[PDB]
RNA sequence: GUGAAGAGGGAAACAACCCAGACCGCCAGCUAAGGUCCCAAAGUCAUGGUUAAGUGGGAAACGAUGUGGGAAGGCCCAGACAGCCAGGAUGUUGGCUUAGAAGCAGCCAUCAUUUAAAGAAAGCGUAAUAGCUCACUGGUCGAGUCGGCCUGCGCGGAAGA
RNA sequence: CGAUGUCGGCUCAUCACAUCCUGGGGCUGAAGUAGGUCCCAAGGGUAUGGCUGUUCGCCAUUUAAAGUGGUACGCGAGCUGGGUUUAGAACGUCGUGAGACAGUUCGGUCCCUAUCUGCCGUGGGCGCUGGAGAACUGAGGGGGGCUGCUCCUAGUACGAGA
RNA sequence: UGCUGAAAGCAUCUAAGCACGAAACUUGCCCCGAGAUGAGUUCUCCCUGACCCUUUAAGGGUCCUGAAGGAACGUUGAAGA
């Protein structure tokens, strides 16, 4: 689940609507990803009225999956589709300004120290 | 040293403000008789009898109650003689109950297992079976044997082979305690333990760190 | 190292010894001399 | 047959208390030590200690020299001992001694924690000096060689436990 | 030649090889090659010799202070070997080539002294000086010691199903 | 020759070695960080997809790390039947011609009512010296086990410094 | 890796003698295990017959009297072919 060389849905504005996954990064020998994992993205069509350019590389975080969040809230938390939020590929934090839905407090992991400044559940 | 026996009663939730509800398993224990010790009088074995099992006899085995102490006889559903090491106890009458145990923080837990269906090789070892699509007649899930080529004239049993499983003891070297009631004889432990409702369990204070 | 087969000695600086089937040459001109035979 | 008949001649107060094969020794510099051999027969007098052959065993005068050697190395042990020669070298490296245990800082994630055998003690007159005291010539040389064994000197480093005797290996090249 | 187309005796199982030839019998009997500790009938024999590997009981080349018999060489009883004590100096800046040599990357010459005693060479230590181990020599303990030869015998050297 | 199913794959044992990461220790024309290079050590760990019927090899992407041989070229009464060498046919060449061809390509039906040994489970018998009920001990078997990063050692050792 | 010391007055990790050393080995702990005939060790329980026949330091029979144990019914089970 979550595949390389395969499209991923966008959960913020000005970052196009479908973007290509190339690497699922993450833990020791892992060939999959879930909510709050980080993904390496590549953009070919970009939609030039947004904030992203044609032929460029980005960093994203997984925010919606059908399997969802499993441990921290005493109940499973499922989401609709398979979607991510785009982040600056060096300087961190989002490149859009309108993240969709509530997101989740499971994103408060060791890989994020400034995410707590955003207006969702994070 | 101390130890008690009981049964798995079911699952509960303790709750937190961190949103986790936390699974906690309930056990109800019995008080321990500690009637007598077997200590070096003939043969080198040492053991302490906790007994505690009481079942209506008709039935119920004889020699497993054939050397009971100078007390009212209560046999069946438990004997739990095990093995004793470096305990220097009273040879007769060292009884204990839950007020000696309610201050315990971490426990060592033991029980018995049952078969995983047919066991064989698939449920015994978690193996994969041969496929039936575009090939193979009658040779899909058959259990196999220790087959090897005869060039050495002797057999080799290095392949993991078919048989039965369970009917044995299983143990936990540490489990955290959550809730205790020394009037209801209740011991509540963090997370899960083997078997289902009404299954017999043995519990004592942990000696592993 | 080098393992050799059967080795003749001809050096004052090698204070050669033998133990457990192997020879140590104990050099201080070139301490990297370590061949196990003699 | 060069020294196997040579009578040792011990000083006053050295009594060498003998019981058949068993030979014991004590003196002003060494606490009671026991020795035992089955290869050669030993007879003693007021100060002259004398080894020799056994019935049914062969070439006994070639073992009596060895049996004389190790025992006469205890006669000197219990009267004056041996001179100090063991030292510690390295930045921050230091030794301390509490009863039978030597505590040694050697650039490791533990303090070595070295324990002594029976009939041997240790003293550090300075944090870099080690004086081993017993009655057997073997135990001091064994413990010195076991202290020597920790890391060993390393070719560009030269650090650890060393003797009061310079060894002809030192590097001064090359820099990358 | 032998088997082929031959019984018996010997030989781990391997026609041939080695003994000797197979008419029949017995309350018998002798040797042949071969064998004689156990297993398997007969010496754990007597005597002489050598070997120590735990060999012989798989092995070439080869190396190393393993060992008897025999014959010689070097050194040797004011005295050898090993050892310990004591030297480690001078004439002299080592000639040729040269970038380069305090003997010590190439070439090869050539004589002495102070002295109880120390090398234009044996090998290092360096920028040199220093200094160190030997050659050589002295003091001292005290009998074989060195390196080879003949005739014999050990050790490893020696990696796969 | 009076009959040994051959090579590739799926499936699983047994032995060995001059070793890919891991054990124990040295060397460098090694200061330290690392790769490198040798000796004993084969106990532990032991990548997949792509071209092919496979391999060699090339290719793609991971990782601490992508070692190998022997065994009826290990195992077709466990499975598969693409390769290849006797149905058949086509593109092409060549011969006087049946045809030939690693010159290709497409195909060409390798199978099975386990006697009896072994193995697994499970009943029954039997010797332990009167007979039964139940345990303790452990000849012996199975499990063990490999690795990044990060905290601590310590920004110490080494090094202008990096 | 070593200690001490002869053969070889030195030296020597072996001769006499002594201390170490791998992830592996023997073992820890968990399970299985005395068909382990090499039959181990222990705790527990129970039966106190007569006469006759066949040459027999062992059997055969008829009654008397019966123990620990065992067989096993159909209700049936997470024991399950």
Swiss-Prot record, chain A:
BP term (GO), one: cytoplasmic translation
Keywords: Ribonucleoprotein, Ribosomal protein, RNA-binding, rRNA-binding
GO molecular function: large ribosomal subunit rRNA binding; structural constituent of ribosome
One Pfam family, short name: Ribosomal_L14
InterPro entries: Ribosomal_uL14, Ribosomal_uL14_bac-type, Ribosomal_uL14_CS, Ribosomal_uL14_sf
GO cellular component: cytoplasm; cytosol; cytosolic large ribosomal subunit
Entry keyword rRNA-binding: yes
Keyword Lyase: no
PROSITE patterns registered for this protein in UniProt: RIBOSOMAL_L14
Recorded superkingdom: Bacteria
Coiled-coil stretches: none
Family annotation (CDD domains): Ribosomal_uL14
Record's subunit section: Part of the 50S ribosomal subunit. Forms a cluster with proteins L3 and L19. Forms two bridges to the 30S subunit in the 70S ribosome, contacting the 16S rRNA. In pre-50S ribosomal subunits interacts with RsfS, which may inhibit association with the 30S subunit.
Family: Belongs to the universal ribosomal protein uL14 family.
Annotated function: Binds to 23S rRNA. Forms part of two intersubunit bridges in the 70S ribosome. In the 3.5 A resolved structures L14 and L19 interact and together make contact with the 16S rRNA in bridges B5 and B8.
The protein's name: Large ribosomal subunit protein uL14
UniProt source species: Escherichia coli (strain K12)
UniProtKB/Swiss-Prot annotation, chain B:
Modified-residue entries (N5-methylglutamine), positions: 150
Domain of life: Bacteria
GO MF annotations in UniProt: rRNA binding; structural constituent of ribosome
Keyword rRNA-binding: yes
UniProt PTM: Methylated by PrmB.
GO terms, biological process: cytoplasmic translation; ribosomal large subunit assembly
Gene3D superfamilies in alphabetical order: 3.30.160.810, Translation factors (2.40.30.10)
Annotated GO CC locations: cytoplasm; cytosol; cytosolic large ribosomal subunit
PROSITE patterns linked: RIBOSOMAL_L3
Subunit structure: Part of the 50S ribosomal subunit. Forms a cluster with proteins L14 and L19. In pull-down experiments interacts with CedA.
NCBIfam families per record: L3_bact
Protein name as it appears in the record: Large ribosomal subunit protein uL3
The species this protein was found in: Escherichia coli (strain K12)
Swiss-Prot record, chain C:
Protein name per the record: Large ribosomal subunit protein bL36A
Gene Ontology cellular-component annotations: cytoplasm; cytosolic large ribosomal subunit
Subunit description: Part of the 50S ribosomal subunit.
Gene: rpmJ
SUPFAM superfamilies from the UniProt entry: Ribosomal protein L36 (SSF57840)
GO biological process: cytoplasmic translation; translation
Organism of origin: Escherichia coli (strain K12)
Entry keywords, A to Z: Ribonucleoprotein, Ribosomal protein, RNA-binding, rRNA-binding
Organism classification: Bacteria, Pseudomonadati, Pseudomonadota, Gammaproteobacteria, Enterobacterales
Similarity annotation: Belongs to the bacterial ribosomal protein bL36 family.
Role of this protein: One of the last ribosomal proteins to be assembled in the 50S subunit, it contacts a number of helices in the 23S rRNA, acting as molecular glue. The simultaneous presence of uL16 and bL36 probably triggers ObgE's GTPase activity and eventual dissociation from the mature 50S ribosomal subunit.
Gene Ontology MF annotations: rRNA binding; structural constituent of ribosome
Ribonucleoprotein recorded as keyword: yes
From Swiss-Prot, chain D:
Keyword Cell wall biogenesis/degradation set for record: no
Sections of the chain in a coiled coil: none
Alphabetical list of SUPFAM superfamilies matching this protein: Ribosomal protein L6 (SSF56053)
GO molecular function: large ribosomal subunit rRNA binding; structural constituent of ribosome
Pfam families tied to this protein: Ribosomal_L6
Keywords, in A-Z order: Acetylation, Antibiotic resistance, Ribonucleoprotein, Ribosomal protein, RNA-binding, rRNA-binding
Any one of the GO CC terms: cytoplasm
Keyword field contains Zinc: no
Residues where N6-acetyllysine is found: 43
Gene Ontology terms describing biological process: cytoplasmic translation; response to antibiotic; ribosomal large subunit assembly
Transmembrane segments: none
Reported function: This protein binds directly to at least 2 domains of the 23S ribosomal RNA, thus is important in its secondary structure. It is located near the subunit interface in the base of the L7/L12 stalk, and near the tRNA binding site of the peptidyltransferase center.
Subunit record text: Part of the 50S ribosomal subunit.
Family under the similarity heading: Belongs to the universal ribosomal protein uL6 family.
Name listed for the protein in its UniProt record: Large ribosomal subunit protein uL6
Protein species of origin: Escherichia coli (strain K12)
Name of the encoding gene: rplF
């Amino acid at each position: 689940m979550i595949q390389e060389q395969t499209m991923l849905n966008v959960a913020d504005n000005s970052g196009a609507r479908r973007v290509m996954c190339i690497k699922v990064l993450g833990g020791s020998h892992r060939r999959y990803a879930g909510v709050g994992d980080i993904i390496k993205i590549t953009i070919k069509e970009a939609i030039p009225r947004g904030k992203v350019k044609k032929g460029d590389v980005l960093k994203a975080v997984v925010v919606r999956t059908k399997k969802g969040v499993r441990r921290p809230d005493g109940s499973v938390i499922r989401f609709d589709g398979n979607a991510c939020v785009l982040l600056n590929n060096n300087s961190e934090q989002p490149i859009g300004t309108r993240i969709f839905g509530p997101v989740t407090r499971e994103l408060r992991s060791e890989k994020f120290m400034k995410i707590i400044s955003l207006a969702p559940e994070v | 040293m101390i130890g008690l026996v009981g049964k798995k009663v079911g699952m509960t939730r303790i709750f937190t403000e961190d949103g986790v509800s936390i699974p906690v398993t309930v056990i109800e224990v019995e008080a321990n008789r500690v009637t007598q010790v077997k200590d070096l009088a003939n043969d080198g074995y040492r053991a302490i009898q906790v007994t505690t099992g009481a079942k209506k006899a008709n039935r119920v085995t004889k020699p497993e109650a054939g050397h009971f102490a100078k007390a009212g006889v209560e046999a069946g559903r438990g004997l739990w003689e095990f093995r004793l090491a470096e305990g220097e106890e009273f040879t007769v009458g060292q009884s204990i109950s839950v007020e000696l145990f309610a201050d315990v923080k971490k426990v060592d837990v033991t029980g018995t297992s049952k078969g995983k269906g047919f066991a064989g090789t698939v449920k015994r070892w978690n193996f994969r079976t041969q496929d039936a699509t575009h090939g193979n007649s009658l040779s899909h899930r058959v259990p196999g044997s220790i087959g090897q080529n005869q060039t050495p004239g002797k057999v080799f049993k290095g392949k993991k082979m078919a048989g039965q499983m369970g009917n044995e003891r299983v143990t936990v070297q540490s489990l955290d305690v959550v809730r205790v009631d020394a009037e209801r004889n209740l011991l509540l432990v963090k997370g899960a333990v083997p078997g289902a409702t009404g299954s017999d369990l043995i519990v004592k204070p942990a000696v592993k760190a | 190292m080098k393992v050799r087969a059967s080795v003749k000695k001809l050096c004052r600086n090698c204070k050669i010894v033998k133990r457990d089937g192997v020879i140590r040459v104990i050099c201080s001109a070139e301490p990297k001399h370590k061949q196990r035979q003699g | 047959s060069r020294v196997a008949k040579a009578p040792v001649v011990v000083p006053a107060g050295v009594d060498v208390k003998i019981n058949g094969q068993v030979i014991t020794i004590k003196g002003k510099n060494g606490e009671l030590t026991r020795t035992l051999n089955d290869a050669v027969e030993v007879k003693h007098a007021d100060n002259t200690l004398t080894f020799g052959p056994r019935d049914g065993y062969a070439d006994g005068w070639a073992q009596a020299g060895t049996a004389r050697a190790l025992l006469n190395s205890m006669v000197i042990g219990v009267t004056e001992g041996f001179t100090k020669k063991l030292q510690l070298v390295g930045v921050g490296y230091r030794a301390a001694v509490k009863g039978n245990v030597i505590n040694l800082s050697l650039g490791f994630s533990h303090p070595v924690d070295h324990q002594l055998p029976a009939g041997i003690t240790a003293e550090c007159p300075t944090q870099t000096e080690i004086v081993l005291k017993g009655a057997d010539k073997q135990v001091i040389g064994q413990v010195a060689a076991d202290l020597r064994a920790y890391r060993r000197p390393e070719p560009y480093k030269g650090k650890g436990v060393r003797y009061a005797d310079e060894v002809v290996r030192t590097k001064e090249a090359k820099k990358k």
